[PDB]
Design a protein around this ligand. Structure first.
Ligand SMILES: Nc1ncnc2c1ncn2[C@@H]1O[C@H](COP(=O)(O)OP(=O)(O)O)[C@@H](O)[C@H]1O
Length: 331
């Protein structure tokens, strides 16, 4: 029947959900399983060994948008081509590569008598070495919740890279700060939207900005993923359904003007469940994801690609044309 291999997971909610969908757990050494779940990223050879009926929870080449240094370099090549479309990414400087370039930006800022804050990630701040770090402009005026800075963790389901299909879960995690903000309690996004409603903010625009952010982010990753997949899977017929799917964890910060900024993409987000908020959300994320796969022999998900809007789809396909063009230039 429909079987599963949960040897590569350490989270009970993953096993719980898979057991709840009706999957029969195979012994760990069994590679025949219809579904193969692994927490961390998989070797490309493992994806190449799959059969066309099998489904694994990771795309090959997704590290181009998950690794903060790769994400910075690729987005940079994209900003230079399409700056108006990609404004959701704070300026980032990869070290020890863009050291001199970063110093020049500080030089101009000094002469202009202006000041900016900068965050250093693997974490500390700076107001202006040969180590592998990254420098990023610091969003100084974040959206505060009762005087508190918070983080958004949204969950993205990518079911295919050919044709590209992207789903956005309309719920997630909110990580409020410990001490109040000046220039960790957990909550749900569903609750945060109800907050925005009571405080009269456009919840629809919030989701729309988030959706466009994700698609345009995956658009940057698409040429990397598509090539890796096709070289990993040379035995797939022209219209063969995707062997790979993936649940990505987007870390996102909103500024005072409720503009969503991309911080990182986690291809291996913790599905741990110590609290009830973690349970309901993450179970719903995993359960509905397997539902959409429809493994044979949506719920709180909304398809953001391909969009029902024709005009928006045209813009996306234009960006994809640029993404693939930018892709060939680098390699
Ligand atoms: N460019 C940035 N601008 C403003 N605040 C940021 C920025 N980057 C991170 N913050 C904060 O830094 C924290 C993220 O820490 P990070 O090391 O990148 O990931 P992790 O959560 O695993 O520690 C978040 O609280 C986030 O709000």
């Amino acid at each position: 029947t429909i079987t599963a291999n949960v040897a590569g997971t350490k989270f009970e909610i993953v096993r719980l959900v898979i057991d709840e969908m009706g999957f029969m757990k195979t012994p760990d050494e069994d590679e025949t399983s219809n579904l193969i779940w692994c927490d961390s990223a998989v070797q490309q050879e493992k994806i190449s060994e799959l059969q066309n009926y099998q489904r694994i929870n990771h795309f090959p080449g997704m590290g181009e948008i998950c690794r903060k240094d790769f994400l910075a370099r690729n987005m940079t090549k994209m900003i230079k081509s399409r700056p108006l479309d990609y404004t959701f990414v704070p300026r980032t400087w990869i070290f020890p590569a863009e050291y001199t370039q970063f110093q020049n930006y500080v030089k101009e800022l000094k002469k202009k008598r202006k000041q900016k804050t900068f965050i250093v990630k693997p974490i500390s701040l700076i107001r202006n070495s040969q180590d592998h770090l990254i420098v990023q402009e610091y969003i100084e005026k974040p959206f505060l919740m009762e005087g508190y800075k918070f983080d958004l963790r949204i969950y993205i389901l990518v079911t295919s890279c050919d044709p590209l299909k992207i789903f956005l879960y309309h719920d997630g995690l909110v990580r409020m700060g410990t001490e109040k903000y000046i220039p960790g309690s957990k909550r749900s996004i569903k609750w945060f939207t109800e907050f925005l409603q009571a405080n009269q903010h456009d919840v629809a625009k919030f989701w729309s900005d988030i959706s466009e952010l994700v698609v345009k982010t995956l658009i940057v990753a698409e040429p990397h993923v598509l090539h890796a997949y096709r070289m990993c899977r040379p035995g797939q017929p022209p219209g063969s359904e995707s062997v790979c799917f993936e649940v990505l964890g987007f870390d996102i910060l909103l500024d005072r003007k409720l503009k969503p900024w991309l911080l990182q993409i986690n291809r291996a987000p913790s599905f741990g469940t110590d609290q009830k908020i973690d349970y309901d959300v993450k179970r719903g994320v995993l359960l509905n994801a397997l539902k959409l796969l429809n493994i044979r022999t949506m719920g709180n998900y909304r398809r953001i690609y391909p969009p029902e809007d024709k005009a928006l789809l045209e813009k996306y396909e234009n960006l994809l044309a640029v993404a693939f063009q930018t892709f060939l230039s680098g390699r």
